[PDB]
């Protein structure tokens, strides 16, 4: 066991679970929505080409990010 091999397993699980959470948050494959689900605005072309399947424009997205930063 050596006490660093188990530490290795712990670190491996920690990094992998973090990596895959931050990957699942991407949702690359998606739907062409074409209009914001918050303000109905035109989600500009470049943002839909970068993130296929967005649901918020950058303004509503950053807004939501602030709140989910604090919590709730």
């Amino acid at each position: 066991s050596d006490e660093a091999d188990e530490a290795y397993s712990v670190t491996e699980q920690l990094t992998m679970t973090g990596i895959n959470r931050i990957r699942q948050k991407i949702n690359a494959h998606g739907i062409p929505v074409y209009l914001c689900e918050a303000c109905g605005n035109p989600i500009p072309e470049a943002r839909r080409k970068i993130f296929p399947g967005v649901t918020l424009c950058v303004e509503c997205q950053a807004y939501q990010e602030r709140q989910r930063k604090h919590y709730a």
Partner: protein
């Protein structure tokens, strides 16, 4: 000798019955002579002599004067171990309420008087008088009076008025009490008090009143009048070095009681006023309290220190108490530890014992031998011989040790394989030599671990080590029958290197005559160990009624394949060694050898495998270099592309095209993906190499690279650590779980610079800090489980029940993740398995489904077998061998006796140690989820079920919750539910739903599943969930063990219809009892009582034990003992933990026959 322990309240007279004398003075010893005092806590008259057969002063100094009482000091001349046995008593000048029966939560004095606790405490600490039988004068019995009020009420009442305050008041309240009379009045009120709180507490009180009647206790014995004194040698005042003494805290508390009691006698004799004598009585009360249980009053009195003193309740409870680590965990003689080394030449049944440890442990045996053979005249001469360590003590050592196992044990005994009997092989040096194939069971590496050896002393313990715990008997994991003798790292790399061909070695395509010739060719160096040759192989196949027909043929194998075939026993096919033979190939090789041939050929095979693996691994010459980390050339190309992608995403983010966290996610993903490309590129560079060849053209074969050979043979390592060695390191976490988005684009064949080596430290220190603390509480799940499943034992051969769970495959959405043959192997069928033709009884019944029957079952494609479960066993106070299954630690069926509950606890706890220590959510995982599972906690969001069957219907709208009623097709609908509209429904009001069906969605509380559907439903739920975790991490543990833990879980019953029986309605009873009760009452001309099955979390079920010696171990000793005293309980031992404590054989193992014969006597 006793067969049972009884307990009760101690009468004052009985406390004087124990006593040998009344301690009066507070003094301890003389301060000059150090002699015991005439009435101190350390007396000689009271507690006996100080030296053996020698009075205090010294007039009588002969053992011939035995038993006579000296005249000048009255100290009877006996042995001074008598002073460790004799109690004294203290005649309290005032009654003092025993703190356990007062400050315990229910407060037996309070709930027995039917009086509030604060009110008794007011009468007790001298606040308010209490009416104690105040005649007819309009006074209220137990009605408190205050001081002024008592005066003025006494005004106009020169008549008695009978009011008292203090502990004497409570004593006169209890003594006057009529218990059967109050039982009668409470029955008469329970007649006509048909309202919940009233008749509820009516019954809850009449229970304790009837119990106090039965137990023989008198109610007023809870008011101490005499106080017993622990004997001196249980609370010594021994001298330390240089005139120094060390005492117990108990002596301090005892002196405090004696002083205040003597001062109270003084105050009463001096006719002091009311304030002083009241305050002295309060002081004596607090002193006696602190003596019994220091800390329940507040505050814990401190000694000559800041810390509280330790008291009697402290002397029993707490891990420093008697139960915890003096009643189970004891220091043991004939034992010793050292530092283990390899000793790779031993067999599976022996251990290298150093000559010096062996000469110390086996000392009495050697003395007996030297005086038996005449080599030593007397035991003193033998002592001097073996002290000089002469030349014949060594021959005597060889003879004594010859067939005499030693138990080897390593500190975290997670399972029973952390103890094995080995035969000692005497060695030089001071390190214990431990077999290599045993480290997996012991969890022992040879980097400084130590092992403790114990010596079995009796013939019966020698035969228990040899027959039971010998290392060649335990080779299968008791959690799952796979062999625990899997060869680990030099062995598998040896067998992989030898059993692994290459395209053009020396001597290609020779046709050898057989394995002997291949070995003779290799060892003379004419052929290479992996040179594909046609070899003539004779394999023996028991394809018969065990007949072993021989068959010879011409296989195509490497030279090492055939060299290794020489070691494989007969019954094994030849395809077992004809592939590369990594790690799983070797484990499966041992496994098929065990399923064909049994235990003796498998032990021989395991040893031969270790020997040949080590030999051909040394000949392998398999070193590790720096040129063995082949960094791929396309690594910097891939990193340039990923760096360009992150630069592009940062440019877009700067232009407001993305947010901040969005771009963080994007860049973390870019780096993880480029890391995957680099790891893939490096492993495709490393996992193959070019080579020439018969005809001369280049040809690709699997690489003989050493780092890869070690990762790919399964010997050690894996492609992830390989990626960190030559590929890039990747992104690193923080302790919070966030991911630092500056990756480690370096490897370890290159270096990390100061910043990347700092960044890696975050996750490294987090992982090590967790692994250091998981090591602390390594065995808490095992202990929690052995608390509840301890007394469960296999006590019967067949219960006959036809109940059984339907074992089927688990199809996790797509394919099966665990087939039926694996879940069903080893279980006893409950009914006849019909062929798919639906008329052919495939496996009849009670047929131990071994591998033959299991293959027959998978062959016909019968995929739902009804097997008998430990949870559906009709046995009482045990389980039968048929409802249990096979052993899984031994291939055979379970024996009558085997203590399967402790096996189940350890088989779930030890494998759990390989699980994550912290829960992670993906279906959560880790050990804490498993512990919460077994605790059967209620999920906050319960998917609500359908309590009754019938047509669905709704009701009132939004009284907090939308209301619903289910109304049967022909029955009544008295059940309606306040379904939260938050609980978004699943079925419309116009679809008649069967009982036990989902209404809302979410986690199903197991209590509701058990109450709606069969016990089989709750058991399948629990095993499927917990095995979901255990399969999440990849760990294999059988369902038998979860099933037995569950059967310990749902072992309480709640009675609905009390029938013609003698059970109260809203009562919970041990289900194993109510079963026999209704069975008996239905035997005669009555009908049984119907109950609702219950369910308790393991920490809740283990708190309900039939005994109290056991229950005072893992519980609060104080509450359990107070309850047992007021109940007059007796422990008829009948348990594992109780018989451990009390010091006799347990009824589990070999002790089963002893207890059976003893029950024969006790029933005769």
């Amino acid at each position: 000798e006793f067969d049972a322990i009884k307990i009760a309240l101690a009468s004052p007279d009985m406390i004087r019955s124990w006593s040998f004398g009344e301690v009066k003075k507070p003094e301890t010893i003389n301060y000059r002579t150090f002699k015991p005092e005439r009435d101190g806590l350390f007396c000689a008259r009271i507690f006996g002599p100080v030296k053996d057969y020698e009075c205090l002063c010294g007039k009588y100094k002969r053992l011939k004067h035995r038993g006579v009482i000296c005249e000048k000091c009255g100290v009877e001349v006996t042995q001074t171990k008598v002073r460790r046995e004799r109690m004294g008593h203290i005649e309290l000048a005032s009654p003092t309420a025993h703190i356990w029966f007062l400050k315990s939560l229910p407060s037996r004095i309070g709930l027995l008087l039917d009086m509030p606790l604060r009110d008794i405490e007011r009468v007790l600490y001298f606040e308010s008088y209490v009416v104690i039988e105040g005649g007819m004068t309009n006074l209220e019995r137990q009605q408190i009076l205050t001081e002024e009020q008592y005066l003025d009420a006494l005004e106009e009442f020169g008549d008695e008025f009978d009011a008292k305050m203090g502990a004497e008041a409570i004593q006169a309240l209890l003594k006057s009490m009529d218990l059967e009379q109050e039982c009668e009045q409470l029955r008469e009120e329970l007649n006509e008090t048909n309202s919940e709180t009233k008749r509820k507490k009516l019954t809850k009180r009449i229970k304790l009143l009837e119990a106090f009647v039965q137990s023989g206790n008198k109610p007023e014995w809870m008011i101490l009048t005499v106080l017993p004194v622990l004997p001196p040698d249980l609370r010594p005042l021994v001298p330390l070095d240089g005139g120094r003494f060390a005492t117990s805290d108990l002596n301090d508390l005892y002196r405090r009681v004696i002083n205040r009691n003597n001062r109270l006698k003084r105050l009463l004799d001096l006719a002091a006023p009311d304030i002083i004598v009241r305050n002295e009585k309060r002081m004596l009360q607090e002193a006696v309290d602190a003596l019994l249980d220091n800390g329940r009053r507040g505050r814990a009195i401190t000694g000559s220190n800041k810390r509280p003193l330790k008291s009697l309740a402290d002397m029993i409870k707490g891990k420093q108490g008697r139960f915890r680590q003096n009643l189970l965990g004891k220091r043991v003689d004939y034992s010793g530890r050292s530092v283990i080394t390899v000793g790779p030449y031993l067999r599976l049944h022996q251990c290298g014992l150093p000559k010096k440890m062996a000469l110390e442990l086996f000392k009495p045996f050697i003395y007996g031998k030297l005086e038996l053979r005449g080599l030593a005249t007397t035991i003193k001469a033998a002592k001097k011989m073996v002290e000089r360590e002469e030349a014949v003590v060594w021959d005597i050592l060889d003879e004594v040790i010859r067939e005499h196992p030693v138990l080897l044990n390593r500190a975290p005994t997670l399972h029973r394989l952390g103890i094995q009997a080995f035969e000692p092989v005497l060695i030089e040096g001071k390190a214990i030599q431990l077999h290599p194939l045993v480290c997996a069971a012991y969890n022992a590496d040879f980097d400084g671990d130590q092992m403790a050896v114990h010596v079995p002393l009796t013939l019966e313990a020698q035969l228990e080590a040899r027959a039971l715990m010998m290392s060649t008997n335990n080779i299968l994991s008791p959690a799952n029958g796979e062999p625990i003798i899997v060869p680990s790292q030099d062995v598998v790399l040896g067998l992989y290197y030898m059993t692994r061909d290459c395209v053009n070695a020396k001597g290609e395509g020779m046709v050898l005559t057989g394995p002997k010739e291949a070995e003779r060719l290799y060892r003379s160096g004419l052929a290479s160990l992996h040179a594909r040759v046609k070899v003539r192989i004779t394999e023996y196949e028991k394809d018969a009624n065990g007949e072993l027909v021989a068959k010879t043929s011409l296989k195509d194998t490497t030279v090492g394949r055939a060299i290794l075939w020489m070691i494989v026993p007969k019954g094994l096919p030849y395809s077992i060694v004809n592939q590369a033979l990594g790690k799983k190939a070797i484990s499966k090789m041992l496994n098929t050898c065990y399923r064909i041939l049994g235990l003796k050929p498998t032990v021989i095979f395991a040893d031969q495998i270790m020997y040949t693996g080590f030999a051909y691994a040394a000949r392998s010459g398999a070193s590790v270099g720096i040129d063995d980390m082949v960094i791929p050339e396309k690594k910097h190309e891939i990193i340039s592309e990923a760096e360009a992608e992150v630069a592009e995403i940062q440019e877009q983010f700067q232009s407001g095209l993305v947010t901040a966290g969005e771009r963080y996610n994007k860049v973390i993903d870019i780096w993880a993906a480029a890391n995957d490309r680099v790891s893939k590129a490096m492993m495709d560079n490393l996992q193959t190499e070019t080579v020439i060849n018969r005809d001369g053209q280049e040809e690709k074969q699997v690489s003989f690279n050493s780092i890869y050979m070690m990762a790919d043979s399964g010997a050690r390592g894996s492609a992830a650590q390989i990626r960190q060695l030559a590929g890039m390191r990747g992104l690193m976490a923080k302790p919070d779980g966030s991911i630092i988005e500056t990756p480690i684009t370096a490897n370890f064949r290159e270096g990390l610079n100061v910043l990347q080596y700092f960044i890696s430290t975050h996750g490294a220190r987090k992982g090590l800090a967790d692994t250091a603390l998981k090591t602390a509480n390594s065995g808490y799940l095992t202990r929690r489980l052995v608390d509840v499943a301890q007394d469960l034992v296999v006590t019967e051969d067949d219960c006959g029940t036809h109940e059984g769970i339907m074992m089927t495959p688990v199809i996790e959405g797509g394919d099966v993740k665990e087939p039926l043959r694996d879940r069903v192997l080893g279980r006893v069928t409950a009914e006849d398995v019909l062929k798919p033709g639906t008329a052919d009884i495939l496996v009849p019944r009670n047929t131990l489904l071994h591998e033959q029957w299991c293959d027959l079952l998978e062959e016909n494609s019968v995929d739902a077998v009804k097997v008998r479960s430990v949870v559906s066993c009709d046995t009482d106070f045990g389980v039968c061998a048929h409802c249990y299954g096979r052993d899984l630690a031994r291939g055979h069926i379970i024996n009558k006796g085997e203590a399967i509950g402790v096996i189940a606890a350890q088989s779930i706890g030890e494998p759990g140690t390989q699980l994550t220590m912290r829960t992670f959510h993906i279906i959560t995982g880790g050990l804490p989820r498993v512990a919460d599972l077994f605790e059967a906690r209620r999920p906050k969001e319960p998917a609500i079920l359908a309590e009754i069957s019938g047509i669905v219907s709704f009701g009132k709208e939004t009284k907090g919750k939308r209301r619903l009623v289910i109304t049967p097709v022909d029955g009544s609908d008295p059940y309606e539910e306040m379904i939260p509209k938050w609980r978004q429904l699943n079925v419309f009001e116009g679809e008649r739903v069967e009982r036990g069906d989902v209404i809302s969605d979410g986690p199903e509380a197991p209590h509701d599943i058990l109450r709606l559907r069969g016990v089989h439903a709750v058991t399948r739920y629990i095993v499927n969930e917990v095995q979901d975790v255990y399969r999440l991490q990849g760990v294999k543990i059988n369902d038998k063990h979860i099933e037995v833990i569950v059967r310990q879980m749902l072992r309480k019953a709640t009675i609905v219809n009390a029938g013609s029986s003698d059970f109260l309605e809203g009562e919970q009873v041990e289900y194993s009892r109510v079963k026999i009760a209704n069975r008996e009452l239905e035997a005669n001309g009555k009908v049984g009582a119907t109950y609702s099955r219950d369910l308790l979390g393991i920490t809740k079920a283990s708190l309900a034990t039939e005994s109290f010696i056991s229950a005072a171990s893992f519980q609060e000793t104080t509450r359990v003992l107070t309850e047992a005293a007021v109940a007059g309980k007796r422990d008829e031992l009948r348990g594992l933990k109780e018989n451990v404590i009390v010091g006799r054989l347990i009824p589990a193992g070999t002790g089963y026959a002893y207890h059976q014969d003893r029950m024969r006597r006790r029933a005769a």
